[model samples]
Target chain A: SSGLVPRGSHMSEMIYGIHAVQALLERAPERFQEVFILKGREDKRLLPLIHALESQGVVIQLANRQYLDEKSDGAVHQGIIARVKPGRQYQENDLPDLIASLDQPFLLILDGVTDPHNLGACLRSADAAGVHAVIVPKDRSAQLNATAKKVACGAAESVPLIRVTNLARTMRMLQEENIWIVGTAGEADHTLYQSKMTGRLALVMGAEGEGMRRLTREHCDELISIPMAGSVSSLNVSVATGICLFEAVRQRS
Target chain B: SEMIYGIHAVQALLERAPERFQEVFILKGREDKRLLPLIHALESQGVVIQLANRQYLDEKSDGAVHQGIIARVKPGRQYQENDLPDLIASLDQPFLLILDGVTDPHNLGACLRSADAAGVHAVIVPKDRSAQLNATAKKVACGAAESVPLIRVTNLARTMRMLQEENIWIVGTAGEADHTLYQSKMTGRLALVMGAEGEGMRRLTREHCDELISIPMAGSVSSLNVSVATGICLFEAVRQRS
Candidate 1:
C-alpha cells in the first residue's frame, strides 16, 4: 500500500453527546454540517432534539451502537453526534468590546485550571450565574474538548470563553475599565459575604491543589474565602465558583 | 482500594467511629514518628496490624499516596426511614438533609461530605433512587461516609410528614419556587430537600414540603449540579444558624 496521508479539509469538528449538540444547535444552527443519531433509540429525552434538527433541514445519518461507540472514543455519547463548523473564538482583543456591552459585567477567571471536568463545571456555573465571560490564560488552561463540552451541560455554547495571552495584563486592563477583581484564597482575612462585589466584577479561582498564582493574587483588589463549616479544607472549584457568584448575585439584588 | 488510607481520613474515622475498623496496615521495617501514635492507639483497641512493603502499600492504595498506613473497614450502619423519629428526638434543633432522587455515587458521596461539613444531623434518601455508600462513595466522601448518618427510606413523602409532625421545617429546592434562598428563614430545626439534576423534586415530594425555595439562576442554564447545589444550600443554612 502507498503511504497513507489524510486529505486536507476545513475545520469541522464532531460534537458528541446531547447537551453539547443541543446547545450548539440553539446557539448556531448554521455551524452544523451533519448529525449522527442512534438507529433504534427514540425516547422523550432524545426526540425533541432530533425533531429540532429535522425541522432545521440539517442532514441526519443513522448509525448503530458500535459505530457511535467507536466514533466517540468510548465516551457516553448519549445517542447523538453532530459535526459542526468552527464557532467564534474569544481572545484578549475581544475582551474590551465584550466588557463594554455588558451593563455591569460579571466575569470568572480560572488561573491555571487544568482539569477538563472542572473547567466544564466552572463554565456551567458561570453560565447559570449569568457571567459575562470566563477568562483563562492561554498557556496553562484545559482545552475545551468533547469531555469538557459534555461536562459543561450546554454552557460551553452559551458562555464566551476568552483565552488571553497574558492573564496579568488582561487583569490590569479590566482594572483600567474600573472592574473590581476578587480572588478566592484560604489566607484571606475577609469572607466572601463581607466583600463588596456588587459593581462591575471579576471573580478569580485558582486550581484546586496549588490555588492562585503569585501575579494573579497580586492583581486582585480583594481576596476572599468561603466560610468552611466542615473539616474538609475547601470546596470543589465549581461549587466554590457557584457560591461566590451567587453571593455576588445576592449582593447585587 | 477497599481500605481507607491517609492521615486525615483515618484519624477522623477513628475519632468518630472506630467500630468500623477491621484491620490496619503499616509500612514495614520502620515506625515513622507520625504513624506511631495511630499504631499505638489501634493496638490499644485490639485491632490487628499488618506490616507491609512499599509495593504492597501502593497496590492496596491503588497508586494513591497512603501516608504509610491503611485500614480496612466493615460496612457502617445503614439508617432507614423508621429510624428518623429516634434520630431527631435526641437533637434540640436538628439540621437534616433530604435527597429525593440523586442516584450517582459520586454525587451521593459529595452530598455526604457537605452534609458532614454543615453539621447536618442525617441525610435521608429514597431507597429506590439513591446510590449505595460503597467504596467509591466512601473514598470520595473523605471519611464523611463514616461520620455522617445516611438513611435510606422506603417512602420519602411519608417521612416528610413524619418530620413535619416532629416540628422540623421542610424546605425543598426547585427552579420555579417564588422565594429565593436568602428570603427564607433557614434557622431552627430544618430539613433541606434537594432533587436530582434537571429533575426537580418529585411531585409528591414537593407537595409535602412546608415551603419551596430556589437558588437564583443568573445565567442561561436552569440549575446547578445537585452536589454543588447541596453544598451551597447546606452552607447557607450553616451561615444563618451561626
Candidate 2:
C-alpha cells in the first residue's frame, strides 16, 4: 500500500459520509487509496455498505471514533471515510478536446463562487446532471479543495473541473464552437422556462448576491431569470446551478 | 447579539418587520444612496443605528459576510403544526414544502429561501427533528424566514394524511422511485416532500406519499443537496404551473 496517507488523518484529505463513500465505490473504485471505518461498530445498515465496499478488494482500515470525527470535518461521515486520489484536472486548452469528444456537450461554468462548500455542491449537481466538464475562472472561483470534495459526495472524483485563465474569453471560445451560452440574472426579461436549452450548452452561475461580473454577463448569448415568487428572492448559487442543469437535462431527455 | 447580515436580508427586515430589530450596525462610510431606504426605515422604527468600522462589523457578525451592514434582531414567530390547516386554507393554490428530516440550519435556510422564491405557502418539518431556524439560517435565507411559514409538525405522517384529505397531492422525492420528476406532471395543489440529504425519508414518511418521484441523477454521486434538490423540484412545479 502506498504510504502517502496516514491512519485516521484529516490531513490526508478524507471524504466521509456514507453516500460519498458508497458513490466512490460505485463510480471510481480505483480512486480509493484506503477506506476507514469505526472499530467494533457493527452498524446493521452500515455493515452491509461496508461489506459491499470491502467486497471490491479495497483495503479497509479501522480507526478510533474520535479520529473518525476529526476526519469528517463537520460533515456526518456515518462511521466510514475514504482517502481518494484527486481528479484529473482540465484547463483552458482541454476545453476544445473535451468539447470535441462529446456529441452534445453540456458544460457548467462558475464565474465567481468562492466558497469551497458551494463549489463542492455545484460539482455534485453538475456531475448529477451529467455535464461534460465544470469550468471555473482560475483566479475567481474556489479551488476543488478538501471541503468541496467532502460536500460533493463523490462528484469531485468524477467531474472534470476545467480552470480557465479568463472566463469571459472562455465564453467567447464556446460561442465560436456553436455551443449555446446561457446565464441567469434576477432582472432578465425572459424566464428560464422560455429559453431553449436542448443543444450543446454552457450554463453560467455567479455568486449568490452579487451575481456575474459585467464582463462575464456580456459574454452570454442569452440571459434569463429564474422567477423569484417569494420575499427572499435569492437561491444559493449551487441550487440555481442544479436548476439550470436539470432544466436542460429535461429538455434533452 | 444574533447578527443578520447581507444587504437584502437587513433591508427586508427593516421594511417588513422592524419590531424584531434590536440594533443596526453599518459600515461607517457605506452611505451609498442605496442605504438611505434602510436607514430611513430603521430610523422610523426608532431602532438604534451605529456607524461602525470594518473591524467592528467583522467581529460583530462572527465571521459571516456582513456586506457592510448587520442587524441585531429578536427571533421571529415560529409556526406550529396547528397553524398548517389555516395556512393551507388561505392559499389560492396550495404550494407546500414538507422537509421530513432536514436538520442543518444552513440547509434549512436555503430551503426556506427556495420555498419562498417558488411561492410555496408554507414549509414543514417535524418540530423535534428539525433544525432551529437560527441566525445562520436567517442570514442564508436572504430574508425568507420572515416571508415563508415554517411549520413544525408534531406527527409528520398524520400531517401528510391531512394534506391528502385536503386534496393536495403529495409528491415525495426518493432515489428508489421508478419515474423521474419531470415525467410526473407537477400541477394543482401540491405538497413537495424532501428528506434529509444523506438518509432518505423515514419509512412512515415514505409510506404517506401519494406518489414518489426520483430526480434523475446522471452523475456519479447519487444525490444533490436537499436545498438544491428542493429548488429544482419546486422550480419544476413553478415551470409547470406557469
Candidate 3:
C-alpha cells in the first residue's frame, strides 16, 4: 500500500518473491517492518516461510490477491510481499575503502543497464561470484530499487553497490590502485577464456545489445568477449557478468 | 490454464510431444503455407482444430508475444529419477546439466533452451530443490522445454553417484573451487552442477561432486544467472567436445 510505504527511501522499499524475502528475513530481520501475503491462496510453499517470519515479530498482513497484485506492479510476488529497509548506498569515495578491505578485490562496473530486472539479476550474479563492490554511473544506471532488489534474491544487501558521477574517472582511480580493468564487447578480438582474469580485477559490463559507452570502453586495460556459439549470438548481460566473473574467479583460485 | 503459445515453442511441442495436444487454435484467413505442416500434424494426430480471428487469438494469448496461434495441450509426461538411467543410456556422449537448487521457473526454462542449443543429453534437477518445469518455464524456454528431457531425481547425491558409476564425471560449480572451468577438461561424459543464483550448491551435492570448479569472475558481483551460467558452461563443453 502507498499509505503503508513510508516517506524516507530507507524504510519504504517493498521486497517480494519467496527467495528474496526469506533471505532478507534471515540475514537482516531488523530491516523488515511489515509483510503481506495473498489471502485465500493456500500456498504450501509459502506457509513455513510465513510462519518463520511471523515468529520474528514481523507484521504479516493477509491481503487479497487484487491488492497484492496491484502493489507488486506486475512482478510475480508469488503470494508474499514485505516492506523492508533498502540497501546501503555507497558513492565513488567508498570504492577504495571497500576494495582495501578485501584480500583479492573484484569490482563490477555497469555502463548503462537501465532495466531494473537486468540490474537486479546482475547484482544476484555479482554477489554469487564474490564481487567486492559494483560501480555504476549515477545517471545511466538503474537504481537498486525494489524491483531490482527483489530479483536479486537478497544479493542487494550482500553486494556493495557504488554510484559514481563519472564512471571513467572512477575507473581511472581503480587503475591507479593497480586493478586490471577488462571490459567485454561483442566485437573483441579475444574471448573471455583467452584472457587472464587473475589479480586485482575490475570487470566493466554494459547494457544488453547496446553495450558499453565509447568512453567507458576506452578506459579498460583490455576488452574481451564471451564467445557466443548459439543461434542467438549473445547472452543476457547478467549471464555475461556471471560467465566473465566466474572465469576471473577460476583464474584467481 | 493448459495452453501453449509462441510459434517456435508450439512447433517444437508439436514435433517432440504431439500426444499432448488436445486442440490447436489458428487465425482465420491468415494461414500461410508455412503453418501447413503444423496444421497437418495437428489434424493427423486427431486434434480438434479451432479457428478464431486475430483479436480473439491475441486475447487468448493474454498479452504474450504469440505468433498467430495458440494450443491447448495435455501436460507432457513428467520426467523423474527413473528416466535418468534410460536417458543417459541412449546418449552417445552424455553431456548433462545438473541444477542443484535452481527454484526459479524462468531460469529453468532458459537453462533448458541453453541445454538444447548446446546439444546436451538431458538436464537433471533434484526433486526437492529444483523448480517444476511448468508452462511458464516452458514458455520462457522458447520451445526447448519440449525437446530437452528434464529428469527430476528423488535424491541428487544418489544420482551423482549413479552418474559416477556410469563414468560421467560430476563437476559441481562453486566460488571456492580450486580449479577454474576452463582449467578442467570437459571433453568426456560430464555433468555441470550449478547451485542456486545466490547460494553456490547444497553441501551434500557439493560433497558428491568429483571435483569443484569455479567460473573465473572478474566483477564486483561474483556470480551469473543460472540460465546464463548454464549457457556459458554448456557451450564451453560444446567448444571443448567439438
Candidate 4:
C-alpha cells in the first residue's frame, strides 16, 4: 500500500509544529489537507505562516488550545499543527537524476545518524552549504519526523532526502558513479583540511556515540577528521557536520 | 594574575579588552612571542608584571596549555535586559534566542557564547527554572555574557506573546515535527525557543509558537546536546538572513 492514509487515520497521525507546518506548506503545498491554528493566538511569528498557508490555498482553522493538544497527541504543537502526507520515498534510480540535474554535484550520506537533532542539524548544514542531496539508510536510522524538521528548520523540505534500503550497497553504487566517499572519524590520522577532496564527493557521517561502523569506515576512500585542540575530544555531531561542510565550502570557494 | 588556558580564550580576552586588566602573568622563560604585544599592552596599562615560575603557572593550570600568558582583569558586570534590546534592535536583521528551563549552567553559558558568535541580539531565560548568570556560566561563556544581553523573564509564555506582538517569529524546536529547520525560511526578526534538555519546550511554551519545527534526524538517537542544537538553529537564521 502507498504511505498515504486517510486524514485523521490514527495510523497516519502526523504531528507538526508551526515552523514544520509552514515549511511543509511552503515546499510541498499540495501535500496537506488542512492546517490547525490555535484560536485567538495571532502574533508576529504566526503572520507569515498564516500568509504562506493562505497563499497555498490550504484550509486553516482556528481551534481551541485543547484542539491543538488533541491533534498533536499532547506533543507541543505550539498552537499550530498540520496534517501532512508522508514524505515521498525515493528509489536508487533517483540518484543519477538528482546528481546530473545539479550544476555542481554535492551529496551527503548519513551512514547512521542516530540522533534526530544531529540529523536535522546536518540537513540544515548541508542545505546551507548547498548540498544537492542527502542519502540515508532505510534501517537503523531516525525517522523523518517533526523533531528533525524543527531542528532542520526548513532544510528538510529543501534538501532531497533519499532513504535507501541498503547503505553499504548504496555506497558501492555511488563509488561506481565516481563519487568519492569521505568518512570522518576522530581517530583518523588525516585531517579534513589536508584531505584531497574533489568533484562529486559524498561526505559520509556516522551515528552518535559511535563514529562510523567498521564496515562503513572501510567503504570510505578517505577517512579524515577535523582537528580539535580543546578538552572535548569530539564536537557534537551537528556541530562537527557544520564545521566539516563549511570547510568544504571554504575549500571549493 | 593567572594563566588562562587555550590560545583563543586568552587571545580573545587580550585583544578585545586588555584595559580591563590589572596584571599580566607569564610563565618564566616562556618563548612564544605571538602574544607579546598583548602582554606588553597590559604592562602599558600600568598593570603589575610578574614572571610566574614555570612550575607554578603550569601546576596552577593543571598542565593545560596556557600558552605562557594570562591576565587578571576586573570582574565584569552581570548582563541585564536593557543592555539586550539595543543590540537586538540594531541588527540589520535581528534574532533573540530564549532558553526556557535550561538548568545546566554550562549549557546556558555555551549557548550565550555561541549566540554571541552568531551575532544574536540577546538571550532570555526565565527568572525561575533557568540557570543563573553564574560563575560557571560566565567562565564557559568566555566573556560573551559581557556582550550578549541575558534577560530573565518571570513567565515565558507571556514574554513570548510580547515578542510575538513585536513582530518577532517565535520558532520553538520539537522532536516530532514533520519539517526540518533548513527548509524553513526565517528572514525577519526572530526569537528561537529552546527547551530544557531531555524535555523540550514545555506545554504552554510550545503552544505559544507561531511555528514549531523539528530538527531533522537521520540517526537513531532522539536528541542533541541542547546548546549545540540552539547554536544550529540560531545560525540557521543567521545564514538565511545573510
Best by DockQ: 2
Q: Candidates ranked by TM-score, best first?
A: 1, 2, 3, 4
Could you report the DockQ of all the candidates, in the order they appear?
0.38, 0.53, 0.17, 0.05
lDDT of 1 by residue, A112-179 (tens): 88999999988988887888899999898998876787788888888889988999999999999999
The residue ranges of model 1 lying beyond 4 angstroms of the native Cα positions read A1-16, A29-84, B1-3, B14-64, B71-80, B219-222
Which of candidates 1 and 4 is the stronger one according to lDDT? 1
Q: Please report, in order, the local distance difference test score of every candidate based on alpha carbons.
A: 0.84, 0.84, 0.79, 0.72
- Tens-digit per-residue lDDT, B1-242, candidate 4: 33355544554555555555666678777576666766676666666877887776677667765667655666544456545545455676557888977998888887887777666767888888788877688677766665566888778887787777677888889876667676577788788888986789888998998888876543222235677677667666755665
**Over 4 Å off in model 3, which ranges?**
A1-89, A93-105, A127-132, A146-159, A166-180, A213-221, B1-62, B67-92, B100-103, B113-119, B126-130, B152-165, B173-185, B194-242
Q: Considering summed lDDT, which 10 consecutive residues are worst modelled in model 1 chain B?
A: B216-225
In model 1, which residue pairs have backbone atoms overlapping below 3 Å?
A128-B219, A130-B219
Interface RMSD per candidate (angstroms): 2.4, 2.0, 5.3, 9.3
Q: Rank the candidates by lDDT, best first.
A: 1, 2, 3, 4
lDDT per residue for candidate 2 within B1-242, as digits (tens), equals 45677778776666556788898888897567767877887898899998789999888767877668888888776667887788788888798899988889998999998988888878988988789887788767878888787888889989999999999999999988989999897889899999997787898999999999999978535568888899999999999999
Which of the predicted structures, 2 or 3, would earn the higher TM-score when compared with the native? Answer: 2
Judging by TM-score against the true structure, name the best candidate: 1
The true-versus-predicted C-alpha distance at residue B41 of model 4, in Å, is 38
Per-residue lDDT tens digits of candidate 4, residues A106-138? 788887787786788788777767777888888
By summed lDDT, the worst window of 10 consecutive residues in model 4 chain B runs over B216-225
Per-model TM-score, in order, reads 0.82, 0.81, 0.59, 0.51
CAPRI grade of model 3: incorrect
**Candidate 4: how large is its RMSD?**
13.0
